Amino acid sequence: ADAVPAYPFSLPHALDLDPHYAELRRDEPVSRVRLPYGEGTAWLVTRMSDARIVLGDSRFSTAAATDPATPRMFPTPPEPDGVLAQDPPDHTRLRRLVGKAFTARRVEEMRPRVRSLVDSLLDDMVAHGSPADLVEFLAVPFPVAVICELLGVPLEDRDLFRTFSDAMLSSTRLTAAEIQRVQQDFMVYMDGLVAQRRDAPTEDLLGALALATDNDDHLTKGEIVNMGVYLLIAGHETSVNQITNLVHLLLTERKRYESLVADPALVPAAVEEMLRYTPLVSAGSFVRVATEDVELSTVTVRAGEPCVVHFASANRDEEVFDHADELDFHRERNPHIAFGHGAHHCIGAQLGRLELQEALSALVRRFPTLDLAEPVAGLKWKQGMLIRGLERQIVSW
Numbered sequence: 001a002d003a004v005p006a007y008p009f010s011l012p013h014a015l016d017l018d019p020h021y022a023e024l025r026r027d028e029p030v031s032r033v034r035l036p037y038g039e040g041t042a043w044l045v046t047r048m049s050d051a052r053i054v055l056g057d058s059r060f061s062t063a064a065a066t067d068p069a070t071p072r073m074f075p076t077p078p079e080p081d082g083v084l085a086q087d088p089p090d091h092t093r094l095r096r097l098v099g100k101a102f103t104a105r106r107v108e109e110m111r112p113r114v115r116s117l118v119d120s121l122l123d124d125m126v127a128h129g130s131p132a133d134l135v136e137f138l139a140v141p142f143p144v145a146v147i148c149e150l151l152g153v154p155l156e157d158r159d160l161f162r163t164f165s166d167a168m169l170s171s172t173r174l175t176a177a178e179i180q181r182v183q184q185d186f187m188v189y190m191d192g193l194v195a196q197r198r199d200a201p202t203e204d205l206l207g208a209l210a211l212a213t214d215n216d217d218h219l220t221k222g223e224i225v226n227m228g229v230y231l232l233i234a235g236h237e238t239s240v241n242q243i244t245n246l247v248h249l250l251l252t253e254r255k256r257y258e259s260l261v262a263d264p265a266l267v268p269a270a271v272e273e274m275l276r277y278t279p280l281v282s283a284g285s286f287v288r289v290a291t292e293d294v295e296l297s298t299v300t301v302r303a304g305e306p307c308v309v310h311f312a313s314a315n316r317d318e319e320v321f322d323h324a325d326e327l328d329f330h331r332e333r334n335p336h337i338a339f340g341h342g343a344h345h346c347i348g349a350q351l352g353r354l355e356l357q358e359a360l361s362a363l364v365r366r367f368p369t370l371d372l373a374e375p376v377a378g379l380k381w382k383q384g385m386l387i388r389g390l391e392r393q394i395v396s397w
């Protein structure tokens with residue numbers, strides 16, 4: 001006895017936006033939806049101004065969305081000791097565990113390591129010679145290397161935590177039980193890695209996490225260990241996919257790649273523009289519940305009513321960006337929310353920006369002749385995961 005549309009609206013194609021988003025933005029920017037898991041209905045938010053209220057305002061709570069009955073985009077009910085499920089000021093204390101490491105200053109200190117590493121992998125890829133798989137030689141091994149040195153994870157457990165991570169970024173691919181099983185193995189594995197540091201500490205985040213275990217009376221082991229897991233998932237899954245998406249946008253209208261080849265200083269502003277353009281999050285968002293009535297553009301969201309944001313739709317608001325439907329690397333202003341907004345703003349924002357910058361610059365400088373060497377129609381996009389990206393990107397040069 002309800003007539004609210006199912007969200008997501010459709011199964012996704014490549015990085016293509018469902019057109020209902022541009023319709024919704026014009027005519028019904030705040031609309032009711034039935035999310036694929038949990039009970040009941042949620043407001044979908046599709047415009048920037050509203051997005052910033054749902055993400056920004058203290059009267060939207062993510063902790064409140066831990067209730068199993070709360071609508072959600074993913075099978076498992078969310079982990080209460082997860083970062084995304086903390087409201088400030090508890091969220092601020094947790095963010096502070098690890099925050100020092102990810103400041104724009106420290107991340108910039110990594111450009112040299114990160115550059116000599118991208119360089120090394122691009123070597124192995126010219127050893128093997130054209131044509132090769134950009135995913136095998138750059139997209140997976142580069143982000144995986146950086147997060148492992150940063151965290152202090154053994155680069156040799158890659159297949160183990162990659163497996164764990166693909167499962168936990170499941171939308172429709174795996175079931176609640178498949179996923180809760182993987183979670184407990186990850187918890188226990190990550191809990192194991194921090195204990196290795198009990199009588200032998202390390203100069204790496206896992207070190208910091210170990211220290212917080214017996215030297216912080218306000219943070220729980222749940223919270224501390226989950227930070228290891230979430231950093232480790234997010235710290236490679238986002239960048240890996242997001243390199244394949246950037247390369248895909250550039251090579252499909254080769255024009256774009258050629259613009260960067262001429263001026264490898266446009267790379268930073270094109271990363272920011274392609275961060276705006278790309279729906280890396282396939283649909284929805286970690287859900288926020290109103291704790292008090294809150295005024296969005298067209299509706300007062302009531303205390304108890306869930307909302308969910310679509311980052312990529314807010315990034316195509318024509319009130320905020322001139323010619324939003326079009327890729328333009330010479331925009332003067334680009335106030336995108338590809339990295340979210342408010343309390344939960346990406347902690348890796350600066351690292352991901354560095355990782356993409358160094359990946360693209362390198363390609364655009366050493367491989368002028370880079371094209372796709374498989375058809376645009378046969379491209380193996382990852383299916384049934386909360387995030388989009390290619391499983392293989394065979395390139396020629």
Ligand code: HEM
Pocket residue numbers: 055083084085095230231234235236238239242275280285286311337338339340341343344345346347348349351352353356
């Ligand atoms: C291109 C790279 C990346 C993109 C596009 C991206 C995108 C996003 C977005 C949109 C959010 C906001 C979620 C929300 O409030 O609902 C987010 C949060 C997050 N990002 Fe990323 N991300 C990237 C790289 C990274 C990296 C490298 C890490 C870790 C090293 C990371 C860790 C996270 C974490 C932990 C959060 C949640 C923090 C919190 O709850 O306060 N991300 N990311």
Ligand SMILES: CC[C@H]1OC(=O)[C@H](C)[C@@H](O)[C@H](C)[C@@H](O)[C@@H](C)C[C@@H](C)C(=O)[C@H](C)[C@@H](O)[C@H]1C
Pocket residue numbers: 073074082084168169230233234238281283284285286386387
């Ligand atoms: C609804 C889709 C969202 O996924 C979720 O909420 C997931 C259940 C989270 O537990 C995932 C697995 C965590 O690792 C995140 C910290 C990863 C980080 C990159 C993001 O926050 C990301 C934008 C995320 O919010 C969305 C993909």
